[PDB]
Amino acid sequence: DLAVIGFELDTRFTNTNRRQRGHLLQTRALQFRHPIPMHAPVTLPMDTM
Amino acid sequence: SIEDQGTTIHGDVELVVENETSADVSSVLAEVDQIENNPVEEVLDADDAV
């Protein structure tokens, strides 16, 4: 029973009619936030008189 | 005057001699100016940024 039973083709449409749009590009932006903390003090005690 | 002085060690004393004393503080609070310029940090539109 040796015979060819089926096939597949590597066929493409030619998009003169732009039916297929393909991948999209869209511009976006991300924003990051870095607040600055206060840190513990250092003190130099000095005489009051 | 107390409005100009800053944390005086010996202190300051003033007498009110006014019949009335209005107080307009609309521009005093510093956060108001920050908001007026930028309610939120200014960010460029995504297309303008690239």
What distance, in Å, lies between the first and last C-alpha atoms of chain B? 53
Question: Which residue in chain B is spatially nearest to A33 when comparing CA positions?
Answer: B41
**Angle of CA points B26, B36, B21, to nearest 5°:** 5
Contact A29, B47 (CB under 8 A): no
Alpha carbons B31 and B39: distance in angstroms, whole number: 10
Chain A residues inside the 8 Å CB shell of B43 = 29, 31
Alpha carbons A2 and A4: distance in angstroms, whole number: 7
3-class secondary structure, B46: helix
Residue A45 Cα distances to A38, B8, B11, angstroms: 21, 19, 22
Residue A25, φ and ψ in degrees, nearest 5:
-115, 130
Contact A27, B47 (CB under 8 A): yes
Alpha carbons B21 and B35: distance in angstroms, whole number: 28
Q: State whether A27 and B50 contact (CB < 8 Å).
A: yes
Alpha carbons B31 and A4: distance in angstroms, whole number: 81
The resolution in Å comes to 3.5
| CA-based R_g, chain A, Å | 36
DSSP state, residue B33: H
The residue to which tokens 């297929």 are assigned: A20
